[PDB]
Amino acid sequence: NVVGVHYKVGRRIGEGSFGVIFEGTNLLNNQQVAIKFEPRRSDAPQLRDEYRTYKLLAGCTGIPNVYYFGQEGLHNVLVIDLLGPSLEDLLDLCGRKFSVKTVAMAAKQMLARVQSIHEKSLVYRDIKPDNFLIGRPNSKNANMIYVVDFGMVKFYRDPVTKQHIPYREKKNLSGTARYMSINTHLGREQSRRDDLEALGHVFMYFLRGSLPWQGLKAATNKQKYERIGEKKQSTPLRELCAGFPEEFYKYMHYARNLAFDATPDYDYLQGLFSKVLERLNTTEDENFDWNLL
Numbered sequence: 001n002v003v004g005v006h007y008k009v010g011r012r013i014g015e016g017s018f019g020v021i022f023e024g025t026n027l028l029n030n031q032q033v034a035i036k037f038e039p040r041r042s043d044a045p046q047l048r049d050e051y052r053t054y055k056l057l058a059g060c061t062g063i064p065n066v067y068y069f070g071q072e073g074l075h076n077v078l079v080i081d082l083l084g085p086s087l088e089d090l091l092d093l094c095g096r097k098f099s100v101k102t103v104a105m106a107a108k109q110m111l112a113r114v115q116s117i118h119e120k121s122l123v124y125r126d127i128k129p130d131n132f133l134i135g136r137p138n139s140k141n142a143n144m145i146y147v148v149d150f151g152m153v154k155f156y157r158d159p160v161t162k163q164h165i166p167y168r169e170k171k172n173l174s175g176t177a178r179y180m181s182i183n184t185h186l187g188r189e190q191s192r193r194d195d196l197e198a199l200g201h202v203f204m205y206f207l208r209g210s211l212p213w214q215g216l217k218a219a220t221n222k223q224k225y226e227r228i229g230e231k232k233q234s235t236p237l238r239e240l241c242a243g244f245p246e247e248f249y250k251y252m253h254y255a256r257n258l259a260f261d262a263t264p265d266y267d268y269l270q271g272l273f274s275k276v277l278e279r280l281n282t283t284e285d286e287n288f289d290w291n292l293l
């Protein structure tokens with residue numbers, strides 16, 4: 001039908017670790033939006049709490065604008081800017097893997113996004129390539145990479161005092177295997193380091209086309225997070241980053257080694273990719289592999 005008083009829904013463009021997303025269209029300007037629906041029940045990670053996060057990060061580079069949030073019957077709606085394909089499809093579309101260049105350039109923006117968030121006293125806690133999108137196909141941001149879905153973001157520090165909160169090693173465990181940090185796997189709580197670490201498992205996913213721990217038999221589901229973690233653990237960073245820019249190794253080695261409160265030297269990490277682009281004689285122009293088709 002039509003919700004958000006002046007936003008009409010279109011087709012389904014996918015779902016996210018939370019709940020379906022349809023691509024609407026504001027009925028008062030003709031601009032294509034993103035509409036997220038969510039039922040009102042046991043769940044309450046409410047687009048609201050996500051809305052509030054889309055609010056906070058609002059104004060920080062590569063963060064989608066928020067446009068609405070209400071209560072339409074059995075649901076909760078959150079209106080958001082439309083955006084291009086996810087880095088995950090792109091990968092698939094670009095031929096199961098990207099090229100050092102493309103990676104290096106993505107890493108920067110990505111890594112930039114995971115910082116902004118951290119500077120808002122929030123761990124992102126759900127780092128996967130499926131969460132990074134590019135501006136709409138033919139616009140002024142097509143060559144930009146955004147972050148989406150903050151359904152798992154948490155406060156790792158009082159946004160005010162910036163005083164870091166606790167450090168357990170005993171709660172739940174309900175994320176996305178393939179890229180989480182080893183800490184995460186071990187039960188440890190997640191700090192800004194866990195975000196940077198999984199980001200590198202993701203950069204190596206791009207380069208390698210896969211990680212060494214994907215696919216694991218003998219288990220089920222609440223156990224797979226084990227076999228995967230183990231392999232991750234029994235997989236040396238040399239072997240993993242083997243045959244790829246040293247910076248990448250340098251990156252992973254850094255991340256996989258920070259303390260639970262360690263404030264990442266974001267500039268150091270950003271510099272590593274800039275060099276990677278310096279060796280290639282290229283520049284941070286957006287010749288991603290995905291603008292040729």
Ligand SMILES: COc1cc(OC)c(/C=C2/C(=O)Nc3ccccc32)c(OC)c1
Pocket residue numbers: 013014015016017018021034036064080081082083084086130131132133148149150
């Ligand atoms: C992982 O689940 C999610 C992944 C998302 O983008 C890839 C989004 C946000 C999206 C968004 O803001 N625009 C889109 C256009 C197509 C598909 C998803 C989006 C989302 O809603 C917040 C949940």
